[PDB]
């Protein structure tokens, strides 16, 4: 079952795997992001309210003046979209914010305010987006790419190996905040725990411990265990858990209960620990020299003298054991050390800190952070608070809190934004534990640590920057706030705000320009994931591994699609089915798999939560029950594929397409080719250029409906209806009654986009694909836009092709073509240029536009109007004059003495110059449109008046048709009220429709409805005039322009471009080609039937560049064409519906298990016919990515045709007239042409302009410039013996003014005689360093 519209051309589909869940809406990232940017959301997270509530309320500098927040309300735009595309404005809505200002009384921060006030003040504009998601900034169409960046949180790294060449790893811990100061912990080979702040100089960690107000026994309390010696009978006997005896040899004969367990010579095994704890004793004796190797934990002081016996972090001496032995302190606290297990690392870190108390530690923090200034108490204190404890100057996101509490194994995902002590202490514990051997560091390229941003996050961030900077201003003006005289727009300036946000969308690393030459161009330019930008990487200092793919990329990032060149792998593109997390990670779909049953629900998985589970791969043959027919099945556990059991599984892949992007889901038979030529297939496939006559591709991939719809370059029926009125320009739909709203009945009118200039100077245009008197469906295509056909996306065209070397015109990769192709004109495209002519008012007067000119012939004057402007449609060539612009050089504008003597003598004088806008050289074409913008208060010209009234007339035509139809709805509603309550069907239409209130009707709500419909009638009248007149005020007015220009005249020139030997055109498999020779028809190869082939490729590209999918594609295209022309063979031959019905019924059965399963029997015998002439040019055939057709089916479908099974037909040359031995492969390949045409690549320069800092020719083509003779081919010249060549070319042809002038004279005098002179760039060099303090001269 289908739409009525889908039955115009149903596509044959292969594919065994039943799809369970379709594609999502494609533009979902941009739309839910920036949708989430502006809406009235409560509860702060996430949005604008997070910005305002995050910063408001704001008080003065304790002057008890405070402003607060109420609400915001964003107004409508002043302009629509496409007019803003015309004029150059920002498509942007105003920002109106209700604040509130109070002022507290004196001696009363807490007291009642004396005065309040509230106004809704204005703060700049922010751009909207279109429903195609783009932004419009200054006439242009721009797209912001989402940024991949490192999630804030805490991380652990080795930096193994290569540092210090000692074979020893390090371990370092890093905190990344969302906004604030970095903080890094690390070790050394000498094994001390060092800390640095914001990548600065190195300090030991215990100084930041003392900075957090901790004493020494607290430190050694935390980071270690208490190890208990006690003064006892003799030699300070030991309390011991024999767990501590693991991993060390018995230093003495370790013995207890009078019993020797482990002697000297044995390590105490876990067997021996089991002996001891089996006896379960702790009170043992060590000899006293065991204690001299130990470090006391706490500080035992003397009792009598009250003095320090011994401090912490110092190794015991036996004499100190005597000093405490005579003291009588019975307890002795020490710490545990095992270099295998619990190394005493931070002890020596407490040795190398020179500091003692809180305050000095604060001093060296203050001195390392602001170096070179005298220390101060509270500057150090408040500085140290402002590095980590400030709600302004420091923040973790809630994402960062989530990553944090996950990382240190906490419980609840929420918490503070700034951090506290226990955070840091736990971090140091964790890093110590990795130093010990438990836990592990984590790779960065794991996708659980990379977070995507989006639009609204970044616009939020820039907006926060603007608000706090303008708040620095506001707090300044408020602390000096003179009361009762300030309304809150003297503190508020919108110009910092609008300066910040228009700075952002103007110039960013991520607000990059949109390329528009393809629906697939934009639709892959919006799903781009960059890793560059602010807070991002650089293209030149990323390693190989961050460019590399990671086994967490599966299903979330496309593996194969990346730009080749200077940034490979940094500009990754998103998958198909992937969505984003609430938090901003990459969630991916799966199927819930129960015990033996694959549940058909979907279920999203993050990155790190995936790894616990085990995943059924998509192409696993289950049999209708959830039950896989096998007992082992290919699954993946943790980044590895291995064969697992039948019941271990947890989840299944949704579909076979989730591994790839849309950029390669269009590739048919993608699985049969190498990744290199696949990558080149995608990226070259993007750059295709739309043709004149679009055409469907035979070997489709099933995605073409989705990308055709979701690209909004087609126009889709918003509601189900019936066609009323077809036109080439507009289209009119009668809305069906069920979807018709009860109030406001109405109809649908869509206005198609005609010929307009793209971003890339190409023709974008929409065509009606529907007939009249026809039911349409809600959500169905109506307008074929550019490179769209019948709701299907179709780039280039498909043609007959064959594989043989043919006289070397297909030597490397050059492509020979027949003349039939260009005779059908089926690669011809349209290009559109936009040219402008300005009119600045300078000193010595304005400038003029008219057809008055000095001293050119009447040839260019023939093709202007009376105003000096070319007519619409006058075909021009290069060098022609579009608009005659002249300057009055020598205009006077003097005193009335002048105007007196002008009245006396006449006005003859002050006429000179010309600066007419001329057509660029070598281009030609046809004018299709003129735009004129006029500065206000300047007199509009005649042609501006005609185009002005023409726009006016169009507008009143549109509103007039609106009032015709809605008026018909209202008075026809009045006939729909005068059915009951006095119908007069003869007397309703005698007088016209206006006096339908006042027939004989009772005193009820129906005559009342006649009255309020006379009301609605009246606001149709009056509102009709005010909308029409407001439109007159829009079009009539003089619009703003740049300061100093009077009028700008835009000219649209239209070029037709066919094809020429030297153009790049290519298939969909990385098979490039420059087209070599357009060779007449008679020399083509041709079959016995007589048909020419059209394009002859080269067989040598196949075995090296392994892309066999082109020849499989070629066979299948041969089969499809065989079916379609078999149909048309039965169709130009007269034949009834039955034979066609049976035949193409068979042609949709086709062997194996498919999802297609359709019948012809449910049809009208006319949509059978309509579909039959849709099939007479070929049969559209789908193919999924990995579940496409096999060899047996394609041989079967060739067998349905009359083509031979091998697919290699014999040929005949058109020149020899005889058979090639070894019959060759033919078939149909779908091919593209690319917009590298040779017309703008070809360039030369004899002698042009010169640069001024060095007399050297300019670079580039647009500047009519020469080539660079780089130094490598200089090395190639002196690699030969060519002496005169590079002296000549290096000097005369380039640098000396004298040598090139004289040599120019010698050529025009027929002499060839160079003159050396001296290169000018040497002269600027040595007078440059001569301007530096260096005496340099040229000697004798």
């Amino acid at each position: 079952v289908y739409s009525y519209t889908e039955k115009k051309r149903i596509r044959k589909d292969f594919g065994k795997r039943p799809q369970v869940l379709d594609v999502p809406y494609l533009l979902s990232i941009q739309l839910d992001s920036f949708q989430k940017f502006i809406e009235q959301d409560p509860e702060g997270q996430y949005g604008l309210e997070a910005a305002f509530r995050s910063v408001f309320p704001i008080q003065s500098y304790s002057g008890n003046s405070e402003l607060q927040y109420v609400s915001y309300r964003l107004g409508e735009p002043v302009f629509d979209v496409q007019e803003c595309q015309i004029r150059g404005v920002t498509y942007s809505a105003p920002l109106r914010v209700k604040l509130r200002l109070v002022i507290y009384e004196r001696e009363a921060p807490e007291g009642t305010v004396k005065d309040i006030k509230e106004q809704e003040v204005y703060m700049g504009e922010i751009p909207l987006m279109t429903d195609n998601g783009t932004f419009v900034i200054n006439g242009t169409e721009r797209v912001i790419v989402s940024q991949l960046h490192r999630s804030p949180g805490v991380f652990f790294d080795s930096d193994k190996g290569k540092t210090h060449s000692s074979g020893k790893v390090l371990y370092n811990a890093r905190i990344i905040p969302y906004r604030g100061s970095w903080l890094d912990f690390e070790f050394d080979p000498k094994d001390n725990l060092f800390v640095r702040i914001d990548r600065r100089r190195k300090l030991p960690a215990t100084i930041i411990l003392r900075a957090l107000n901790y004493t020494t026994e607290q430190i050694l309390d935390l980071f270690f265990e208490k190890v208990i010696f006690e003064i006892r009978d003799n030699k300070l006997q030991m309390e011991l858990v024999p767990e501590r005896l693991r991993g060390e040899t018995a230093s003495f004969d370790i013995e207890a209960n009078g019993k020797v367990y482990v002697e000297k010579g044995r390590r105490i095994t876990a067997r021996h620990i089991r002996q001891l704890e089996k006896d379960d004793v702790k009170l043992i004796e060590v000899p006293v020299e065991y204690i001299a190797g130990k470090v006391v934990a706490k500080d035992y002081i003397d009792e009598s003298t009250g003095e320090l016996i011994c401090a912490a972090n110092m190794e015991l001496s036996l004499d100190l054991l005597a000093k405490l032995s005579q003291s009588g302190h019975k307890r002795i606290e020490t710490l545990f050390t095992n270099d295998l297990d619990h190394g005493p690392y931070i002890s020596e870190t407490l040795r190398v800190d020179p500091t003692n108390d809180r305050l000095s530690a604060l001093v060296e923090i203050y001195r390392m952070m602001r170096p070179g200034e005298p220390p101060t108490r509270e500057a150090a204190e408040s500085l140290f608070e402002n590095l980590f404890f400030s709600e302004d100057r420091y923040d973790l996101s809630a994402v960062g809190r989530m990553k944090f509490n996950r990382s240190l194994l906490r419980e609840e995902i929420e918490g503070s934004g700034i951090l506290s002590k226990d955070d840091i202490i736990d971090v140091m514990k964790k890093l110590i534990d990795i130093r010990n051997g438990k836990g592990e560091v984590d790779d960065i390229d794991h996708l659980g640590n990379r977070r995507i941003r989006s639009v609204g996050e970044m616009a939020e961030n820039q907006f926060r920057v603007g608000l706090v900077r303008v708040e620095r201003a506001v707090k300044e003006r408020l602390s000096l706030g003179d009361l009762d005289t300030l309304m809150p727009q003297d503190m508020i300036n919108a110009k910092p705000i609008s300066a910040a946000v228009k700075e952002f969308f103007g110039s960013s690393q991520l607000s990059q320009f949109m390329d528009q030459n393809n629906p697939l161009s934009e639709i892959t330019h919006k799903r781009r994931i960059s890793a560059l930008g602010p807070g991002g990487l650089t293209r030149e200092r990323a390693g190989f591994e961050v460019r590399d793919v990671h086994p967490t990329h599966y299903g979330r990032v496309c593996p194969i699609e990346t730009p080749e060149g200077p940034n490979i792998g940094l500009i990754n593109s998103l998958s198909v089915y992937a969505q984003t997390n609430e938090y901003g990670f990459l969630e991916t779909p799966y199927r819930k798999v129960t015990d033996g049953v694959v549940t058909d629900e979907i279920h999203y998985l993050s990155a790190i939560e995936e790894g616990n589970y085990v995943i059924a791969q998509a192409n696993s043959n289950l049999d209708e029950e959830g039950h896989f027919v096998e007992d082992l099945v290919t699954c993946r556990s943790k980044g590895e594929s291995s064969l697992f059991s039948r019941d271990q599984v947890d989840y299944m892949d949704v579909s076979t397409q989730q591994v790839v992007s849309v950029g390669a889901s269009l590739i048919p038979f993608l699985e049969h080719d190498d990744a290199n030529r696949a990558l080149m297939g995608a990226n070259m496939q993007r750059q295709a250029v739309p043709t004149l006559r679009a055409d469907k591709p035979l070997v489709g991939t099933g995605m073409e409906r989705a990308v055709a719809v979701d690209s909004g370059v087609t126009a889709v029926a918003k509601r189900g209806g019936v066609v009323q009125y077809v036109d080439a320009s507009r289209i009119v739909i009668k809305v069906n009654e069920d979807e018709m709203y009860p109030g406001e009945a109405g109809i649908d009118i869509y206005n198609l986009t005609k010929y307009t200039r793209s971003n890339q100077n190409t023709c974008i245009n929409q065509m009606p694909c529907v007939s009249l008197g026809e039911p349409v469906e809600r959500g169905d295509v109506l307008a074929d836009g550019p490179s769209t056909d019948l709701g299907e996306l179709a780039l280039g065209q498909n043609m007959r092709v064959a594989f043989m070397p043919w006289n070397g015109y297909n030597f490397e990769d050059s492509i020979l073509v027949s003349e039939r192709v260009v005779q059908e004109d089926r690669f011809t495209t349209i290009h559109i240029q936009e040219l402008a002519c300005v009119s600045r008012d300078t000193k010595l007067g304005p400038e003029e536009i008219t057809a008055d000119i000095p001293n050119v012939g009447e040839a260019a004057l023939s093709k202007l109007d009376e105003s000096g402007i070319v007519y619409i449609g006058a075909e021009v060539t290069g060098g022609d004059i579009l608009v005659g612009k002249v300057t009055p050089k020598g205009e006077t504008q003097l005193t009335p003495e002048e105007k007196l003597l002008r009245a006396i003598f006449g006005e003859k004088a002050s006429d000179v110059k010309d600066s007419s806008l001329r057509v660029p050289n070598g281009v030609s074409g046809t004018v299709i449109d003129v735009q004129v913008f006029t500065r206000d208060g300047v007199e509009k010209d005649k042609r501006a008046l005609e185009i002005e009234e023409m726009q006016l007339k169009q507008a009143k035509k549109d509103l007039s048709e609106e009032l015709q139809i809605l008026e018909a709805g209202l008075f026809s509603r009045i006939r729909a009220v005068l059915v009951a309550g006095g119908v007069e069907a003869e007397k309703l239409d005698k007088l016209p429709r206006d006096r339908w209130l006042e027939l004989g009707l009772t005193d009820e709500e129906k005559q009342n409805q006649l009255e309020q419909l006379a009301e609605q009638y009246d606001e149709l009248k009056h509102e009709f005039e005010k909308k029409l007149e407001a439109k007159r005020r829009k079009i009539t007015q003089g619009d703003d322009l740049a300061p100093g220009v009077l009028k700008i005249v835009k000219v649209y020139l239209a070029v037709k471009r066919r094809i020429q030997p030297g153009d790049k055109m290519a298939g969909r498999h990385g098979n490039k080609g420059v087209i070599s020779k357009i060779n007449p028809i008679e020399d083509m190869p041709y079959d016995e039937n007589g048909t020419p082939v059209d394009i002859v490729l080269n067989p040598l590209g196949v075995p090296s560049r392994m892309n066999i999918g082109q020849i499989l594609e070629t066979h299948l295209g041969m089969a499809a064409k065989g079916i379609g022309d078999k149909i048309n063979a039965m169709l130009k031959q007269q034949q009834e519906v039955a034979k066609l019905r049976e035949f193409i019924q068979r042609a949709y059965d086709l062997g194996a298990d498919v999802r297609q399963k359709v019948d012809l029997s449910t049809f009208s015998d006319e949509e059978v016919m309509r579909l039959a002439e849709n099939l007479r040019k070929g049969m559209p055939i789908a193919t999924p990515v990995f579940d496409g057709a096999k060899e047996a089916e394609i041989k079967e479908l060739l067998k349905l045709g009359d083509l031979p099974t091998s697919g290699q037909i014999r040929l005949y040359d058109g020149r020899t007239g005889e058979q090639f031995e070894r019959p060759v492969t033919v078939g149909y390949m779908y091919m593209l042409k690319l917009n590298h045409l040779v017309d703008d690549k070809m360039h030369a320069r004899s002698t042009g302009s010169y640069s001024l800092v060095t007399q050297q020719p300019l670079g580039g083509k647009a500047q009519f410039g020469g080539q660079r003779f780089g130094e490598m081919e200089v090395w190639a010249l002196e690699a030969y013996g060519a002496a005169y060549t590079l002296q000549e070319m290096l000097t005369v042809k380039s640098d000396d003014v004298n040598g090139r002038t004289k040599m120019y004279k010698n050529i025009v005098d027929g002499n060839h005689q160079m003159e050396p002179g001296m290169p000018e760039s040497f002269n600027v060099l040595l007078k440059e360093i001569r301007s530096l303090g260096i005496n340099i001269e040229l000697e004798d």
């Binding site: 998509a618 420059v1074 075995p1103 070894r1222 690549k1241 070809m1242 004899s1246 081919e1273």
Partner: protein, 653 residues
């Protein structure tokens, strides 16, 4: 300069000059006012940072910016770096009289000429048009000629038709690594606007026709035209400067055509008749009465110059094919016959051209090379060499070899299930048996392909080499190898992992079938790692050449003969196994230090100061001499140079 409008694109230098004299004058007025030492102290420090901020910004601890928060440019960086004047505007300048566009083929040219478009020609030679146009008096004054070359009158096509008669031009491709990247041609004017290019130049340029652009130049003066035709002209360079191999080797498809020419199916039309001369063989082919790959005893006649360069006729009845006797007519006079009596792979035709250069000089090698290009595309096109999906043949034993292999990893795997083996041992045994089974599939598909053709021959049956298109394209040496067809028919490889180690499960499938999801996923790991390495590897390699071209830079062969007796001792190198580089190539073309004592005990074979060309190398090659002390450039006693007798041969001349 101004930008578009009333604003002005500033220079940095003018900005900091403004700063420094503002600084100076304020310091002067402060000295006038007798300020305290704090202020004038501070100001002098400001002048210090001002002046060095002029000299070298950034070498002081923090730089300065004017706008865009971006550090402005001092005088020091105006010299250093990738766009200071040395590498930017002194070694590489932009040049007039140049053009640039996209290349294409046009094989009908001879190799001493190239295609050139009419528009680019009419732009590049405009002053010559002015000169001869003044000479003929078609227009007297200059601006008349300006509008004549603008308005396109028909007379000028005769004129630039005339002046491009013998005026050479240069071509350039942008990655100009070694010195064959610049060669010269004689332009033939072309309707259209792309540059047509002879095919044999493409391999020397490494310029595939995927869309490479090339640039051209014109030597203006007379002496440089003589340098072009004398040295830059493409007929000069046929041997590499790196080695004496020809670089005008036929590239890819002509060798397919010739390989298809000299072959034989075992029974064909005209099987084994007789014939007196190759013209009759041509009549038999174009008359279509015998097959092309069909053997026939013919009469041929040849020449040789054993005497004083003297060419002698002699003849016989060789047994050969048809097509060997066909392309025998293109070969010039001084060759042996048996140069063409085989299947003529890319190597055989390469050394064919090489010995043609060694024996018959220059010009017959040249015109011979053009002619074999013509017949190469002729019979390649008439051959009709396709490809098909049915051409790739799956070995039927593949399924069973994989089957026993997975049984074996089940056996070692169950040795690890009960833990009889360790991890790395199971690892290594599994990866070894996958290596072994992989090789079994490799010679499985090779043995299936290479000789699959089994046919009658006027009798019962006989095997011979295969007429499969792939096996011809790999066997002839056109493109690809056994490794790439191994990746087509048989299983492909064991792909590495991102760690740099190797994955235990091989990619069992092949490209003719479908790969799965994950095999393809592993493969795109390997590919991305590959071409990323190409990017950064290019970046390093250019820097290596950029460096050591500077350290040499200066050594010029300036003298004849140093007259010394030092030098080094050449021996054939042996790795420790086979000789991996023989004697005769390390010796070839380097003049000895002392005389070659023959190992006849006290016999002088070769004197002490002789060039060793091929005859001498065969001479001591026969006497099995093991070592020769030779003159080297490390021992040349020349001041500021190298004598030629310490260096030896040109290797392209």
């Amino acid at each position: 300069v101004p930008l578009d409008g009333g604003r002005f694109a500033t220079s940095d230098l003018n900005d900091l000059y403004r700063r420094v004299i503002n600084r100076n004058n304020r310091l002067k007025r402060l000295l006038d006012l007798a300020a305290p030492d704090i202020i004038v102290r501070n100001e002098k420090r400001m002048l210090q940072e001002a002046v060095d901020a002029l000299l070298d910004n950034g070498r002081r601890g923090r730089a300065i910016t004017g706008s865009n928060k971006r550090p402005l440019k001092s005088l020091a960086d105006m010299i250093k770096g990738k766009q200071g004047r040395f590498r930017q505007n002194l070694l590489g300048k932009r040049v007039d009289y140049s053009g640039r566009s996209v290349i294409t083929v046009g094989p009908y040219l001879r190799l001493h000429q190239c295609g050139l478009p009419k528009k680019m020609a009419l732009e590049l030679f405009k002053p010559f048009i002015y000169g001869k146009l003044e000479l003929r008096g078609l227009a007297t004054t200059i601006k008349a000629a300006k509008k004549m070359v603008e308005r396109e009158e028909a007379v000028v096509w005769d004129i630039l038709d005339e002046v491009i008669r013998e005026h050479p031009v240069l071509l350039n491709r942008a990655p100009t690594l070694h010195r064959l990247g610049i060669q010269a041609f004689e332009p033939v004017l072309i309707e259209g606007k792309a540059i047509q290019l002879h095919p044999l130049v493409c391999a020397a340029y490494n310029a595939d026709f995927d869309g490479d652009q090339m640039a051209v130049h014109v030597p203006l003066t007379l002496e440089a035209q003589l340098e072009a035709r004398a040295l830059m002209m493409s007929t000069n360079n046929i041997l590499s400067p790196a080695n004496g191999e020809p670089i005008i080797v036929p590239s890819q498809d002509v060798v397919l055509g010739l390989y298809y020419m000299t072959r034989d199916c075992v029974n064909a039309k005209g099987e084994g008749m007789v014939l007196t001369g190759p013209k009759e063989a041509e009549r038999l082919y174009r008359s279509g009465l015998a097959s092309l790959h069909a053997r026939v005893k013919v009469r041929i006649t040849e020449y040789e110059k054993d005497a004083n360069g003297e060419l002698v006729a002699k003849t016989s009845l060789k047994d050969t094919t048809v097509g060997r006797a066909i392309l025998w007519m293109i070969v010039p006079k001084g060759l042996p016959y048996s140069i063409v009596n085989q299947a003529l792979g890319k190597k055989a035709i390469s050394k064919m051209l090489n010995t043609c250069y060694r024996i018959l000089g220059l010009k017959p090698t040249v015109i011979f090379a053009d002619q074999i290009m013509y017949t190469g595309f002729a019979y390649a096109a008439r051959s009709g060499a396709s490809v098909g999906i049915d051409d790739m043949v799956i070995p039927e034993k593949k399924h069973e070899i994989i089957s026993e292999a997975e049984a074996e990893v089940a056996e070692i795997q169950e040795q690890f299930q009960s833990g009889l083996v360790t991890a790395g041992e199971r690892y290594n045994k599994v990866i070894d048996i996958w290596a072994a089974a992989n090789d079994r599939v490799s010679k499985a598909m090779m043995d299936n392909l290479q000789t699959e053709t089994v046919i009658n021959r006027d009798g019962q049956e006989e095997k011979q080499v295969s007429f499969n298109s792939i096996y011809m394209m790999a066997d002839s040496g056109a493109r690809g190898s056994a490794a790439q067809i191994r990746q087509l028919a048989g299983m492909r490889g064991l792909m590495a992992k991102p760690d740099g180690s190797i994955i235990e499960t091989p990619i069992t499938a092949n490209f003719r079938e479908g790969l799965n999801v994950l095999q393809y996923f592993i493969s795109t790991h390997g590919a991305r790692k590959g071409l990323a390495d190409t990017a950064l590897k290019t970046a390093n390699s250019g820097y290596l050449t950029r460096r050591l071209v500077d350290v040499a830079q200066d050594l010029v062969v300036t003298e004849d003969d140093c007259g010394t007796h030092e030098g080094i001792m050449m021996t054939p190198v042996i790795e420790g196994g086979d000789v991996k580089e023989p004697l005769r190539d390390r010796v070839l073309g380097r003049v000895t230090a002392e005389d070659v004592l023959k190992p006849g005990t006290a016999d002088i074979l070769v004197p002490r100061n002789t060039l060793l060309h091929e005859q001498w190398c065969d001479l001591l090659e026969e006497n099995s001499v093991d070592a020769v002390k030779v003159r080297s450039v490390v021992s040349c006693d020349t001041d500021f140079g190298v004598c030629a007798h310490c260096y030896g041969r040109d290797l392209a001349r």
